[PDB]
Amino acid sequence: MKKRIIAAALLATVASFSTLAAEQVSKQEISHFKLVKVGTINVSQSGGQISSPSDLREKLSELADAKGGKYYHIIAAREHGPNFEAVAEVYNDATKLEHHHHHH
Amino acid sequence: MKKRIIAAALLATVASFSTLAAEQVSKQEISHFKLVKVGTINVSQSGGQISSPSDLREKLSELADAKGGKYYHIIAAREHGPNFEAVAEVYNDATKLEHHHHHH
Numbered sequence: 001m002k003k004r005i006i007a008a009a010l011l012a013t014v015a016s017f018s019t020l021a022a023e024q025v026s027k028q029e030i031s032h033f034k035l036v037k038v039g040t041i042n043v044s045q046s047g048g049q050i051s052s053p054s055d056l057r058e059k060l061s062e063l064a065d066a067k068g069g070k071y072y073h074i075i076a077a078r079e080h081g082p083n084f085e086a087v088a089e090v091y092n093d094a095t096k097l098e099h100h101h102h103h104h
Numbered sequence: 105m106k107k108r109i110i111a112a113a114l115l116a117t118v119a120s121f122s123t124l125a126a127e128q129v130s131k132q133e134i135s136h137f138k139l140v141k142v143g144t145i146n147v148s149q150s151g152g153q154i155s156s157p158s159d160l161r162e163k164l165s166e167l168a169d170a171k172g173g174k175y176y177h178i179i180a181a182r183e184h185g186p187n188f189e190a191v192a193e194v195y196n197d198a199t200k201l202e203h204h205h206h207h208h
Contacts, residue, residue, distance in 0.1 A: 002205040015172065018202045022168045023161055024128035026178035033157045053137040054197050057127050057175070064126035070158075077132035090126070097125065098158040104121055 021057065024071045025091060036092040038069045043086035050084055064090060070097055129175040129195060139195040142173040147181075147190035154188060168194050174202075 006013075025035065041063040043056070050056050064072055069090035076087040129139065145167040147160065154160050160181065168176045173194035181190035 004206050013200065015200070015202075015208065017169060018172070018174070018204075018207075020165060020169045020174040021127040022165050022174060022176045023126060024130070024178075025157055025161070026181065028181045029157050029160070029178065032181070035157065052197065052199065053129060053133055053139060054199075054203070056133060056137075057129060061124040061127050065124045070125055071128075072126050074130040074132060077130075077136065086132075088130075093158045094156055098156075099125075102123055102125055104123065 021061075025073065027073070030073060030091060033094070035071070036094065036096075038067055038090045038092050040087070040089045041067060041069075041072060042088070044080075044083055047082050047084065056086065060086070060088060068092075068096060127175065129177065131177065134177065134195055137198055139175075139198050140200065142194045142196050143171050144191070144193045145171060145176065147188070147192070149188035149190075150186060160190060164190070164192055172196065 025033075029035070041060070043050075043059055043063075045059070050059070060072060064070075067090050070093050071091045072088035073091060074086065074088040076085065078085050133139065145164070147163050147167070154163070164176050164178070168174070171194045173196045175195050176192040177195060178190065178192040181188075181192070183189070
């Protein structure tokens, strides 16, 4: 797919920005700030649905959007065999969805 | 010589948004997929600069972008007297690439 791949002949491959996707709260923030727990989401797909760590989170936010949460606190993650299981409980900040421009 | 008036494509609209909420990777994915440790960011605040967990997330994303990591991992966001100390490690996908092809 596409052209120009660039082999590993370049010893130094540096990339800044690249539009990050970082957004979640840990056990501390939940207990400290007292967030709004909006339920639970869990991944349970057949093996090759997740080709990389990128795939995983793309399916996590996918479920989070359907829920209407702002963060998800992952509690369990294992391969249960041919199926991959990742369980995360969903939290919102102090209200329903911060940053009032993400509606689609 | 064989004139056949064929081929009609009414293809319209291809919107690339997918801009959701709630992302980031946790401990299990890091240890499982073996993610790229790109460093550690410490959010050191004094007084009431941060009002909500949202603002913390803002600063976490701010620092991670400039570090070259897509996801952070909060290991301890706590208060230190008049100061606020949030310790988060920065991780990038085990591939160093992105969802886009070629920029450099």
